[PDB]
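Notes to self after the Tuesday call (sharing in case useful).
The group wants a holo model before anyone commits to mutagenesis around the pocket. I volunteered. Ligand is zinc ion. Logging inputs and output together so the record is complete.
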Amino acid sequence: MIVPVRCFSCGKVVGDKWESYLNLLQEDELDEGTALSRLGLKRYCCRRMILTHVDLIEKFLRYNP
Amino acid sequence: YNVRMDTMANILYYPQKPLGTTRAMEYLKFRELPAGQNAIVAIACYSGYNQEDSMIMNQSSIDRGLFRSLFFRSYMDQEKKYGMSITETFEKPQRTNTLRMKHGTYDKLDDDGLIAPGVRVSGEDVIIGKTTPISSKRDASTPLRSTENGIVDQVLVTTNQDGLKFVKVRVRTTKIPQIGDKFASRHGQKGTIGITYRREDMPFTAEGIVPDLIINPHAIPSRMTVAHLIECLLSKVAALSGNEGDASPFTDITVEGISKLLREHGYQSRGFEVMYNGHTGKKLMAQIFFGPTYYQRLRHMVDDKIHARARGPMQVLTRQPVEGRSRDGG
Amino acid sequence: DESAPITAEDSWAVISAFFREKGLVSQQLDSFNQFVDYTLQDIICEDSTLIISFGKIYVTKPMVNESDGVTHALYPQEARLRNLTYSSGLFVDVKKKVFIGRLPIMLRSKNCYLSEATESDLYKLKECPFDMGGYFIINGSEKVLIAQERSAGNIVQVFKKAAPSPISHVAEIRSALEKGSRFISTLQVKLYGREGSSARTIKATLPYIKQDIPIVIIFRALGIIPDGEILEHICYDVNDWQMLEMLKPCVEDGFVIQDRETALDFIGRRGTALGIKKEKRIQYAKDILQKEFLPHITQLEGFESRKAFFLGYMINRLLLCALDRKDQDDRDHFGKKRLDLAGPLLAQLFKTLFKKLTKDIFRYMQRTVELAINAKTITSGLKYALATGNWGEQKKAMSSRAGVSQVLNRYTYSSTLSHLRRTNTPIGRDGKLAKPRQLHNTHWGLVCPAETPEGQACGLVKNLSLMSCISVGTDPMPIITFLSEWGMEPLEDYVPHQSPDATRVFVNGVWHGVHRNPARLMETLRTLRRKGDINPEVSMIRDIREKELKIFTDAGRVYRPLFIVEDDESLGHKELKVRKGHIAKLMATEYQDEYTWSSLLNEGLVEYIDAEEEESILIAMQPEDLEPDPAKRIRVSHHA
Amino acid sequence: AELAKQELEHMRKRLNVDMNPLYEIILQWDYTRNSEYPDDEPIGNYSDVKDFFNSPADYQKVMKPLLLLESWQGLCSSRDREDYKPFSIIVGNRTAVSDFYDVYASVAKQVIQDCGISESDLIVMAYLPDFRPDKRLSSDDFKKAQHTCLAKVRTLKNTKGGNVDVTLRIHRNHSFSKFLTLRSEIYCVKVMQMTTIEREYSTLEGLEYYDLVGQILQAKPSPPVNVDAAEIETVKKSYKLNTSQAEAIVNSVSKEGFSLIQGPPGTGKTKTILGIIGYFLSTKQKILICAPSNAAVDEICLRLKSGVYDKQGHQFKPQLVRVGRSDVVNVAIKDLTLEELVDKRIGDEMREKNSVNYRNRDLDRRNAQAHILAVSDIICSTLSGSAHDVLATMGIKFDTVIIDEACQCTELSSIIPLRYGGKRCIMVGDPNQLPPTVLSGAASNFKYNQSLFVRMEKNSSPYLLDVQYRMHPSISKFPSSEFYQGRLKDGPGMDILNKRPWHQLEPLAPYKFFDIISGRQEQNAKTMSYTNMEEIRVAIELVDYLFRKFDNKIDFTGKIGIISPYREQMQKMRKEFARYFGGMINKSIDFNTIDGFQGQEKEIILISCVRADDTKSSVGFLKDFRRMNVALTRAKTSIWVLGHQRSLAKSKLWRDLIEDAKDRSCLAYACSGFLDPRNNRAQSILRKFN
Amino acid sequence: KYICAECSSKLSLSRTDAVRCKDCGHRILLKARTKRLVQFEAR
Amino acid sequence: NTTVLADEFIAHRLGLIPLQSMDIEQLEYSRDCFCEDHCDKCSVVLTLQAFGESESTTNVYSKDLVIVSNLMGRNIGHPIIQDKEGNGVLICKLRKGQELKLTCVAKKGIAKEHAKWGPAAAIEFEYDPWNKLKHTDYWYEQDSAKEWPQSKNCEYEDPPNEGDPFDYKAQADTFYMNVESVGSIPVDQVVVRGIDTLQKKVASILLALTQM
RNA sequence: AGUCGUGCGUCUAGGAGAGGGAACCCACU
Ligand SMILES: [Zn+2]
Ligand SMILES: [Zn+2]
Ligand SMILES: [Zn+2]
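Result:
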């Protein structure tokens, strides 16, 4: 549903930058790797945590309830 | 799934798309509805609990949101009429004129006879309170599963095709990975967790990365599963570069190209990474194959696969133990 | 640029178009749509006459008739929540409209609300857009009908027999009507006597005749009295004396019969039912020979020579197999197998229930010596059929072959997709015969080599590949008319002795006639099919070695799309019809959402190929590999 | 049917426009900011009001910045000119609404009652730890406060102990929320009411669903439709109107859509409205009359109370509903107000019974008001009041919408009443009159002050009312020659006015221009308003002379009105008149600004000009021709113009007026003690200036 | 005591009463969450 | 709670939300102090309130949490905000009619009981960049040096010389440690508190030995 | 360049438990 609060591997907080990640991908039209590096994700654990996430919360909210 | 009252539904807490996805997955829309998560796998025999294809999963990751699942079970009840002018009633039994009473606690039932969402139910607690008049009445409640428990998620009441009152109660439970739970990669490897280690005990790489999973190397040779290592390498390359990797069967790319890209990303070409013992910090004598890989939590879980009997109910026909753990069999 | 070669990567774009045009559940939805559109009307018309008459059948949108309430539109979500049956009522006009029952409606069909619903509409209805439908909501439970594999009919299959058994080779054909009143007619002709038995006799088991009769008597009854004519029909090339030598005992034993009446009497001798052979039994035997013997080829007495020619062809194939010049037929080949989807199964269930209702109303009318249609008879029957999976004419039946309908699995989206596209084999899960369980080479491109259950069901339950579709069926009459008008000589005028070279044209297993210029006819048929005049699902196969042309239009045939390669090119090297311009148009259409897979089919860029046709074509691995750092996998050289 | 469903959906959307974007935009502003614009964005974003709008999106994009600028200017004006009573509140739990924070605070009932805080009031909050409890908190501290945050009142719930729970909505991203800790004292002061701004924004957003959206965007009135002259003559005879007025009314009613009627003052504008209403009623069809100010609505209601004649000549009095508060509306209109009509129509067990009785009374009042509105035929109100929540809840379509003083109201205000499915619109206004009220000069620079009626007049010429009766022909001469470019004809009473006297005497004439030879004006820094003593002395002398001439022969009760461009000058004149004449000035003489005096007519009008110093070539408000036309047209018999000769002569329009007066011999040199022969200094100055 | 699937409006119906929504013809009639205090832990 | 999510799911998400813990030492464990339940002396109480509107989804962040208990002038329990926008950690999304209303009680604890208390995300620890101690046998196919890139810390130590023999007396030393903090505690305070905890554990062991 | 129209609302505190066979299908070691 929502981006995980902390990285599973190390525990770094990654939920703050999900909106920033989307803005960089859309507003700045930057590639995935460049946006992730700008956000400040060095270890590939957080990189795959952010990149591999899927926003199912929006799809669930598409329904009336 | 919130509105779907399926008999048994399993929802992954944090679905993740694989780092290496075949080009046919988008047509199948697997990326939109992934079934699994990308976990950092180390192919090593660290503590000896991953033998026989078993695996070691990080306890810190488990409690931090790794492979957590939601299990929804729906119970349906009807007031089917046995004889005209006689029908069942959904009401809380009061012990008056009732001869069939079970161990299920009826306090959770409200005046209407149905537990509202947010009510703790376990064991044989009655979920639906139904009584059939007899000619004063006999209890016909639907007790909760003995081996399953959780918080009731939703309750709905409607009318059947013939107009009889019908009730459907969906109960939701949170299941966390345990040692007995079964997981599997995308290459036919099935493993049961042997031990859960915190992030401190598990070995860490030169960059401080602690794997979420540890798999014994002996699973690779006998099974001839060379594709798992290539998938792990491709996932590492994709994560380092940030671009999703193409893992289609007959892709032009080869292992050498992936290794060259990984080397360009400042890592060992073949994916081996120096790791340190978490118990003492000593560097491991042999380097450890390391990297992300996609895994799936199979429905087979020990919680629902554990049974024990001690002078339980016996079949009337043969006076022998009944069959089925759910029915307290032997 | 526009006509420049095409790379392997660009092909993926085309694949995308396919999934946009058809999707992962295209086969079931198309089968159900064609069923509800045409097969229901055909079944109604077949039994419309009664001693009363049914003009047309209409299907409304799904609705629920709640007791002490007003009927209202019913949606799949409401049906699942309330455990209601997602079915639409059927209205049939009766003359000297009546509600005959409720037909279950498959999701994403042409008679469901979600069909004409956008993503916002689907969300407003609490329906997941990712859901592909393709199932039936019965009592709330989601049931999917698994494709049933059967041996293709109207085809002669020749199989050897074990040495202990006196029979040597048996050629069997499962004749059945392709339009209506379907009934299984398994006609088997057996060659008695093993090698060196000195008794090379052939006997055909005529339906309802327990005692096998020599083929000579059958030919005499048909009308071919002269022995030379029988031999010419059996053997086309008089040069081959081996066939005549092998058939000599057959004619020697059949020489006793010389008159049609005697042959009919002899055929009628067996299976006596208190009748007089000379009195109203010759007509009975003639009617049996007209209908029971090879019903598929025709059902009229105007031209009975087609049956004789087909029997001669069957005997020729049997003799070729016995002489070892022709390889024994294999059952595992998909060219001889048909996968019946929900379409044919629902058609059979309907036919049966409608026949039962017709009998019931006839009895009611008989009782009313001086309306009242029991609609439940059909609705309840269909509900039971889709509930327990027992596919039988009645509940009491114990041989209903359960397992046809299975609860749809929704553990994960991939599981649901696999289940919706699953196939089942009627062969019992028991036994230890590995041959049927093994996947034949014909499964390439039609059945997933890897996806299959492990255990008893292994090798029986099959899952179709991504780019695999099941033919929904089409009327062959236009093809027959085109062949007749184009120059196909009638089978009646066939003169094999004066026509040494001629290609037999088979349509749905019917030997309509022969053609002298097979190459031109085949090229014209391919051009018409590529242009779009003829439905692409039809499969046309030309075999030069046997000099035989086969055309198949029956449903249940598995086919896949492939690019067409033609030598016409400025460079001169073999190249595909699809070029960069078509890919650019497809990409532009995708970005806009004009030019879709339908346009590709119409232009002839992509052609559907079935299992049978693959035996007469060469397929390249990649668009540009076979046409023109030791890390890359070794690639087979382009010898061809 | 499908069309009915679409119409219902459009009406619901128009009547249920979300205000969240407006709150988000407004709350981001800084109260302490002192600038011509709410933000520092480039000036290029603002664009002038285009005559033609390609699509509703472009119209909304052009209008929204202007509305925001007007709101910011109004906020600044409320902050500076007005100082509301500050109060203090205790912070509570915060609810994270979509892009907003709702804070629940407990306040004393007496404090909010004294302050006057309602559910639709905007406030500014601040934290002042060093604020002394005894210090007199004022808006100056809020302006100079380091931290301030705008908030919107959402709900006011009263509870035992005299405790009012207030839900304040603030911007989520605003940093001031870090100071909103539990049990924290926050000093809040009201700024202004957002009801009008919210209604304007809702109308702007919903303009897409308006039936007349295309006409508004194009601003092209529907083509005139020919009508038979016999019908026009019959209507004129039946209603006793003028030929031109009858023709204009018939043409406007015949055509469906926007109708333009240009009624100069004194041309029976109220009479024209009455005739239009009577003609429409003669031909249920609810009619909604909307006026910019409550005074116009009260006047229309008073005129309607007398009844309107039909074609048959049978006078009738349709039920009239006034949508307005009793305090703001005129006393005579109290009976016609909805509340009074509803009251006339109507005519812990104890706690539960009392609560049930109160709920029953509320339900009965709601039913009574709904029934009155449904049965009512004429609904008179203001442009802002036309969007009252009761009318929106009723959802009753108004086929005919009449707009008064179309040139005195903004486009958004004029379009507000159209939300109720307005198919026929009749706008009446004179462009030469005062322009629509605007708080920002920058907004005026972007043509924001320009109203829709102005564009409609530019696209097509309205039906100007040529005939005037109250206005003296000499008075209307110059405005007709210049302001109206002709097309004005004096009525039969050119010189048969009832107020014959004080005209024969040479000193007093229907039109005069008494300039001042010398005059010095002092400007006050606090008010920035010029004040001159020569003008006041001349006016006092003239009034005293007029009273002496006719002290007892004729009573000047409500017949003399002195108007000056500047508020400070008018206040000084009132103070001097009270000091000298005494209490008689309360009724005999009326003192008010020219803009405020609009809508009032008196026999004698004294237009006093404050601009006297010639050091600065700037003219000011006197340059505008509309203000001069308004000032001149409010007189009936006598006009006394006071002002320095050179300063007025600097302006082109005033120079032309002076030249015309000289041609008509209406120029007479005046100074202190002009009518005082004892003061030889005045006579000597007059002789020297000759 | 009960809410509508579509209208999402309280009904508070009693025994021996129709289970159909008063506002609309839909009769899913979902029930609101229990008023009893509920506590959860992140473990 | 009426959001599409589940109560357990949102509770788990909230648990992982970092909270200010600079004055954690002043705070006492709930299991230690004699209190009925979550007294202000051993717990921090926050309230989360939110709901959607007409057509704008309501995003719940860490900053939405409002402290309700009395901290007695202690800068503890404040949600940690580090993103440039300042919104914080996204918690959930509410649609029109979806009301979220809950209370959160935070207790003092260690990461051993649950990873949510982890003050450091990744703690990189390295030593002996050049293979001087022979602790690791680099896996090589053509050349060990070429296959394995030199570590960043290698520049801080003299490269080995093939001329000299292996130093069997050498021991691990010069450990390069990089500590990253989630945000609850600064890295300097993180290391200081780790040292303090280790010293306290050793002192407790000594006290137990003396007592026994 | 010195002034201005527009909006809001009126009643609220009393002890204890015991039970479904057959058939079909999916799936695990
Ligand atoms: Zn990480
Ligand atoms: Zn409802
Ligand atoms: Zn405590």
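Two things stood out.
The first helix of chain D runs from residue 2 to 15.
The CA atoms of residues 60 and 204 of chain D lie 7 Å apart.
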